[PDB]
């Protein structure tokens, strides 16, 4: 439920929205929040962000060196579980090509969805305060009491005659 500015999954810029409803949006669904929380966590190289030297991933250790596939998978699979709301990891297809020296892995992560605790900070309210009456209706009655009775009588006259 971690709120934050929404990042476009397709381009990487802020998700200002479609041309018909351009604006700014907050990440509300846990899925969207977790997506960007993993994306930033994996995209920032370790130590390259000032104000926090411990954040990021240490790509320099592996890239450019002769490395064992098994060691890399452990670190990749470990960084994911640093988020407190990750249920499990389903599958992991780690493959390496020696000709091009490229490495490419696949996997998915499962996360549940929570409640909103309070709507005070977001948009709307859930209550239905009453509406003041109109004109002399309060002190003298209402005509609808006649209309509903007339309709009931008419429908009952309709019911008895077979159709």
């Amino acid at each position: 439920q971690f709120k934050d500015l929404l990042l476009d999954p397709l381009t990487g810029d802020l998700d200002f929205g479609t041309p018909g409803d351009r604006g700014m949006r907050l990440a509300l669904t846990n899925q969207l929040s977790l997506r960007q929380r993993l994306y930033l966590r994996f995209a920032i190289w370790a130590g390259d962000w000032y104000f926090d030297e411990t954040f990021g991933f240490p790509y320099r250790t592996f890239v450019g060196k002769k490395t064992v596939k098994a060691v890399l998978d452990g670190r990749i699979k470990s960084e994911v579980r640093q988020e407190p709301d990750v249920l499990q990891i389903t599958d992991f297809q780690s493959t390496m090509d020696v000709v091009s020296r490229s490495y490419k892995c696949f996997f998915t992560v499962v996360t549940a969805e929570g409640e909103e605790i309070s709507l005070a900070f977001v948009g709307e309210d859930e209550y239905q305060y009453p509406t003041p009456p109109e004109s002399n209706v309060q002190l003298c009655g209402d005509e609808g009491v006649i209309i509903n009775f007339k309709n009931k009588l008419y429908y009952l006259i309709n019911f008895r005659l077979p159709k």
């Binding site: 605790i117 309070s118 005070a120 900070f121 209550y127």
Partner: protein, 112 residues
């Protein structure tokens, strides 16, 4: 009647919270009970170790809780109010009470 803000409250949401607070250099004990059907907080105020609470009332927004009770030697003379930080239409809830949860329960003391 000049008054200055001097204390703020927070609630963890437990239905039977009870704790001691100090106001205007005097000390009091407070009890908060959650009502299911009426979805509202019931507050009881009394002296430390008192047999029975001195005041019991229902909490609501923008209502002076202590108004009719500033005639007793053991009741604070300040002002106790609940007002929201977010949209003005939000009413007091269970978990939405606190300095940043949405509702600001506050006590303010007159200047003497």
């Amino acid at each position: 009647r000049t008054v200055v803000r001097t204390f703020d409250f927070e609630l963890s949401g437990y239905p039977d919270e009870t704790f001691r607070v100090v106001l205007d250099s005097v000390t009091y004990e407070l009890r908060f009970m959650w009502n299911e059907r009426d979805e509202s907080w019931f507050m009881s105020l009394g002296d430390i170790g008192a047999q029975r609470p001195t005041i019991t009332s229902k909490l609501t927004c923008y209502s002076d809780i202590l108004a009719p009770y500033r005639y007793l030697d053991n009741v604070p003379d300040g002002n106790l109010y609940l007002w929201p930080l977010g949209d003005i239409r939000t009413r007091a809830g269970r978990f939405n009470i606190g300095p940043l949860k949405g509702i600001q329960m506050t006590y303010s003391s007159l200047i003497e």
